[PDB]
Design a protein around this ligand. Structure first.
Ligand SMILES: CC(=O)c1sc(CCOP(=O)(O)OP(=O)(O)O)c(C)[n+]1Cc1cnc(C)nc1N
Ligand SMILES: CC(=O)c1sc(CCOP(=O)(O)OP(=O)(O)O)c(C)[n+]1Cc1cnc(C)nc1N
Ligand SMILES: CC(=O)c1sc(CCOP(=O)(O)OP(=O)(O)O)c(C)[n+]1Cc1cnc(C)nc1N
Ligand SMILES: [Ca+2]
Ligand SMILES: [Ca+2]
Ligand SMILES: [Ca+2]
Ligand SMILES: [Ca+2]
Ligand SMILES: [Ca+2]
Ligand SMILES: [Ca+2]
Ligand SMILES: [Ca+2]
Ligand SMILES: [Ca+2]
Ligand SMILES: [Mg+2]
Ligand SMILES: [Mg+2]
Ligand SMILES: [Mg+2]
Ligand code: NA
Ligand code: NA
Lengths: 567, 573, 567
């Protein structure tokens, strides 16, 4: 195909395959026509809603073959990451719901147990499929059940250490499971790493290796899968697909068609970071840039092109990224680790043990801080203030706009020790950006408005919304800048001169920046009323970022109501 | 009422609105009611700037409105616009960030004669030879569709360029692939001469609809409201679209409207015969002596100068339109019946009839003469028109007699020689005039395969193949070299080369053709086959495309003036 | 669900058994969800045959079924607000097989209409009258002791109108037994704006129930049954999706508000106005554009995109639109109120008292002047010349084509005071439009044709037809341009040089432009015969615009006949 259909395509066979049981009643000679019809519907519906695109096209045939051969949902199918699982959802009683995909109260971005019995494991983060499938296989055997266990994992997801740990353990217990490597020689960017060069190691680890086979030859897929379904012990099938298969524009540009917006401001914070990284690297030859397979997302694109000898994509290996930075810092170089808040969860131990405990000079640029929108709770950056500020030695910063991000990145970089700067997805208020590269004083907030009875202590990008509230209430507003060290002097002054302190952050209230203020007030015996605004103690369902923020009360309307209700 | 301008402005005309349309993006910010004023100003500037630099003239005036409408309606440069030939693309250049550079047009290091990809992002395809626009735009449209770029592809082709076979091939293929593209036939019932052919006859009556094309028109190519409205409607249509537009060559300038042939090109405002004129006189003279002579040109009566011949012998003159391939095979058929066809064709255009020359003429050893004008460097038209290869690509073809006259008298003599020769013959000569030597008025051949020693000397021998002879005689004076007017590349004067190789210390070959595969290499091949061990210095055109400039400037760059030849021989010795 | 509009009458055996509410009420609750599907099939089909309003009716298919199933119609009073959503209502009230005549001459009307059926309690078209009318019926029923129910279905858009606020407050005061059902789909024609939409009763004395799913028939029937017998003012909040059941309409609720029947001219006058508004705004920062919820119809689309800070949608609030403009003009701004002639009569007092009495600089761009076609007499712009020309200070203008509209908008805009420019729906003769922005002399007509004997004084778009008649009669023809101030010098000249003066206008003859000419002739004692052509003193039944103009004698044939008979 060359264009995305704008009207629903005619899919008479797909319409008869609304669930796997229905699909399995069709004949083999029908599956290649079904594949065509599924590809057309997929193009149509993702064109309608936006969403992940290329990876799903690559597994259209694999998905058909899997549900045709295996007795799903009794047999357990685990998709790694799940961004390639739209065909899976189309064939599991959700085709006519795809119009709600990634919309409030609609289908989720990834497989989700609560959404369908056909989703065995909620995914989003990568490389969990083998571990989860092995647990189900072990349990099923102990229960005396005869079900199969299958994990589909891409070549990029396979670069993570936890996939290696799983492959190793499965051999040890001699589990009856099938791992299918979906190898398209791609991640988001090109798959760079020693494992992609290799793509036997799988044989030597205790797995029976079959392949590589054509992942788009349905006859070979069904016959091969049929053979291995009833084979015993750890089985490993190497499949080769093409990302974007069947849509030429995506085959020709797999990066740009990894995801698309539905068919028909200022710079993104990631772009501000990318410019800062290039500018600082131009002035300091010691700066090194690290990403775990997210060059495009964190926006190290220009940096990678201009400073290729100082740019490092470690594949989907968050752990190694951080300890690698620690080693670089030991030799006097200046590593910057670009990592999403949600993915830094996977390198927590390396940050604590290898960086913080040693007080090594490593800067963490934490993107996608806060609510991330349609990708949903698996990717929310809800916790990084809480899980970092309890770590001794960490400098924790929360910029309120573009200029502040540039300044605090510079501040964290020039600081000799571990520093973190957190910022959200998307763009900001579009304030002027100072082109200079100058730091700000550590541990000092900035008073943005002087008012009367309420003091709003803002940690991060809710400042503009708090300013609206403060103009309505004639309140004091502080751009806190730093969670740790806290501007204790300023907090103390405001606690004496105001009747109510209000803290605002795009992080879990539990353990968050507002609780840092609470800890200070308590330790000094200051008993001013304190209202903590932030993310609630549940997982916020996917929606537009504005709808999720409104749900959490972090727009002007929600902030003002909370304040006035307290007063 | 439209006004007819009658004089070329000598001073920069006042064009305040054109100055606000320096690029298509700026033009598209203007209002549709301003475009007809813009068209008048663009015409005034066009007349002024070509009067300053010389260049192509009438064709550009005919597409002023069409060019304005195209950049107004289409999203250039993202939408792809392909101009056929490109001689009519001065308005295009003026609207695409090059207005104030038009003063450098066709000068060394200035704007080139035609659209050029390296010159501007608004130039999608380098043109010069005709009839490539449809094929090129089709390829662009096919690639854009596979890439998902939703680009528009537009080819503007004149009624003359549409007479070429390759345009017919592209129209038929575009229908097969159901390409989303627009072909605009710029019909003005003119080529350089009057457009004479069966296609021209059919276009006057009005299928492209029988082919897989949606035909719209004809429409007035000088009615900007209609052009804009029509292009707007067709821009968003799918599949192969064909818009028939009617224009007037020279529109707006009364002298060019009256005399479209004479105003196809002009020299900027304020010697012996041209070689083309020497050929034209020979053609008439031989035709008066031989009823068998037939004269053929692919739409270049004026350039090759068959003018007097076409008037004196209309029944024996054949303009085949821009159809180089058919011209050659037609000559072959004529020769089969005992007639004596002469194919007048520029060196750069004969490469489009190469297969007809080999397969239909040379394989059959048929009696056809090729009068190859514009051999060598052609000057301002630049590399797309360079006659750089005809010695190389003809000399490897068995049966070919290949000749290189050195002056006016030699051209007449070698035309007679190749004409009378019972088989295929080629005589190459350059644009412009020569040394103005006396021309023997008789019509007699010379001995085939024999050069003429024009200076007896020693030590160094200059083996000259063509018009650099006069420069080589200058160099020979200081060196006391011998100089041979070789006359024939094929058959080579082997007996003389063998003598000189034995009596001299250095052989120097000179030719206005690529050194690679050229006439010097024929000398080289002969020396090798006989085991002759004499140093050989091969002078000629280099292995790159020579940028446009005055002929003298291009020859100097390549080292084919007296100074360059002397330096080369001196540095070898 | 459905993706294409049926081209052949779909089989609807159960719908065909519910031809009236009494027949509907004999079916069982379990049959209603199938009935709803059959109704949508028929609705999509019939509107595809005739055209008309589309999305809103699809949104109330379930609500309409539930109301007639639970309530004892027609004895119980059901009032539909606006009525564009009442096609299902008509289909269920003995007009299903007459829907083929919908919006055609002598066929069913565009909206509910008392004369059309005993099931139509109140003729609607203009919005927000349902609560007032239902309250009136309830007060009367109570005094008569009838114990009948009174129900008003009102959309969230219609609820933004002041008169609905007035009805809600009075109903509370009198403690009326009535049910107000809010049909909340978060849509007007465009997206619903205003602080009410942002909020979406108890304090106003109403018992509020909901929100409930307006497409869940079990919940609807059960809820309505419960509230039917509750006493006092009852308020039910229902949530529906505009275009429910037809994917293209659900995706594009604005474009599917109304459709043309399934199967080259100049710009619509509304488009000429929209282009003028943009052109003038680019030359004058003072211009502000106001619309009461009719961005699409009046065509402020491009203006609202290019000048969003100077565009104001006040919801369905004609009154406030005008007084707001008066306020902006007090500060030196140049407001333009875009408003249909038929809707301007709801802001008559604000035009008189707040604008004209103060002689404030406000331009009224009066669209839909004259006959409007299939929407019928509730929407006719029949009276604006009559009700505006009697108001001192008003500049009243009647452009005859596209170029004249642009010129007279500029004239009224630059005029320092109140100005009105009226023009019809649809397109015009397609004459060239001068791109410049210059006014014309106030109070002067232009002679378009010099003739003799009879002079045609044309105010507005009948000029083209008058020119046709003038061809056969060799008549003088004047494009008057201005009703007020009148070109008295020109009328004086014509009265002394012709035997008959003929006035032509697309406005009521009574009080119209022709009567301004007669008033001048009388005051000067000029006794030239006067023939006044225009709209008759009755409400013209819906039909094609060309058929309604022919009925009124305002086409060339009708004008010619009337002139010849007078002569
Ligand atoms: C969007 C998202 O979450 C994806 S998809 C993807 C690479 C996918 O490569 P794979 O070869 O496994 O699949 P393919 O697309 O079919 O080639 C990454 C790194 N991410 C972000 C990411 C980063 N880091 C971790 C631990 N998990 C995830 N999901
Ligand atoms: C100078 C040059 O290269 C031109 S312009 C022209 C005819 C132009 O006719 P057209 O109708 O297509 O355009 P118009 O001028 O607007 O009428 C010819 C034959 N030539 C010489 C020529 C000969 N043969 C070929 C293959 N290409 C070219 N360019
Ligand atoms: C009939 C007409 O011209 C319609 S329909 C409509 C939208 C009403 O939205 P609502 O939420 O009440 O209904 P919905 O379609 O179900 O969402 C408007 C503003 N209008 C124009 C209009 C303007 N102003 C007034 C006083 N009355 C009307 N009818
Ligand atoms: Ca540092
Ligand atoms: Ca945010
Ligand atoms: Ca204050
Ligand atoms: Ca000339
Ligand atoms: Ca011969
Ligand atoms: Ca002689
Ligand atoms: Ca010379
Ligand atoms: Ca004007
Ligand atoms: Mg991959
Ligand atoms: Mg031509
Ligand atoms: Mg609504
Ligand atoms: Na993309
Ligand atoms: Na519509």
């Amino acid at each position: 195909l060359h264009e995305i259909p704008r009207e629903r395509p005619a899919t008479p066979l797909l319409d008869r395959a609304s669930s796997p049981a229905e699909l399995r009643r069709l004949g083999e000679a029908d599956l290649e026509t079904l594949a065509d019809e599924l590809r057309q519907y997929l193009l149509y519906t993702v064109g309608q809603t936006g969403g992940h695109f290329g990876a799903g096209l690559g597994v259209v045939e694999l998905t058909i073959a899997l549900h045709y051969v295996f007795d799903t949902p009794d047999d357990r199918l685990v998709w790694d990451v799940g961004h390639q699982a739209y065909p899976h959802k189309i064939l599991t009683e959700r085709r006519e719901l795809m119009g709600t995909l990634r919309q409030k109260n609609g289908l989720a971005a990834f497989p989700r147990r609560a959404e369908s019995e056909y989703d065995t494991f909620g995914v989003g983060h990568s490389s969990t499929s083998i571990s989860a499938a092995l647990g189900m296989a072990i349990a099923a055997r102990l229960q005396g059940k005869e079900r199969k266990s299958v994990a589909v994992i891409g070549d990029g997801a396979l670069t993570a250490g936890m996939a290696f740990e799983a492959l190793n353990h499965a051999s040890e217990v001699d589990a009856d499971m099938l791992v299918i490597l979906n190898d398209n020689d791609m991640s988001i960017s090109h798959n760079v790493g020693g494992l992609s060069n290799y793509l036997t190691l799988f044989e030597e680890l205790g797995w029976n290796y079959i392949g590589p086979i054509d992942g788009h030859d349905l006859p070979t897929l069904v016959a091969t899968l049929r053979n291995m379904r009833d084979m015993k012990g750890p089985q490993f099938l190497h499949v080769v697909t093409k990302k974007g298969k069947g849509f030429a524009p995506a085959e020709l540009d797999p990066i740009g068609y990894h995801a698309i917006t539905k068919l028909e401001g200022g710079p993104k914070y990631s772009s501000v970071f990318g410019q800062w990284l290039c500018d600082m690297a131009a002035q300091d030859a010691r700066l090194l840039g690290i990403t775990p397979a997210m060059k495009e997302g964190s926006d190290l694109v220009a940096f990678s092109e201009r400073y290729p000898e100082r740019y490092f994509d470690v594949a989907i290996a968050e752990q190694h990224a951080v300890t690698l930075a620690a080693g670089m810092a030991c030799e006097g170089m200046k590593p910057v680790v670009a990592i999403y808040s949600t993915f830094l969860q996977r390198a927590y131990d390396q940050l604590i043990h290898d960086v913080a405990v040693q007080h090594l000079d490593v800067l963490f640029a934490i993107d996608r801080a806060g609510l991330v929108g349609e990708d949903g709770p698996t990717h929310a950056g809800s916790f990084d203030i809480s899980y970092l500020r309890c770590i001794p030695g960490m400098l924790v910063m929360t910029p309120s706009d573009e200029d502040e991000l540039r300044k605090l990145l510079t501040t964290g970089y020039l600081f000799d020790g571990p520093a973190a700067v957190r910022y959200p997805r998307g763009s900001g208020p579009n304030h002027p950006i100072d082109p200079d590269l100058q730091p700000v004083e550590i541990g000092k907030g900035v008073v943005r408005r002087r008012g009367g009875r309420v003091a709003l202590l803002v940690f991060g990008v809710q400042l503009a919304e708090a300013m609206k509230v403060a103009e309505s209430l004639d309140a004091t507003v502080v751009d806190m800048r730093f969670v740790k060290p806290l501007d204790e002097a300023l907090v103390r002054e405001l606690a004496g001169s105001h009747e109510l302190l209000v803290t605002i952050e795009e992080n879990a209230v539990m353990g968050g920046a507002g609780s840092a203020v609470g800890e200070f007030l308590a330790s000094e015996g200051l008993e001013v009323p304190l209202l903590q605004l932030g993310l609630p103690d549940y997982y916020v369902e996917h929606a537009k970022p504005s709808e999720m923020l409104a749900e959490c009360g972090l727009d002007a309307a929600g902030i003002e109501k909370a304040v006035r209700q307290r007063l």
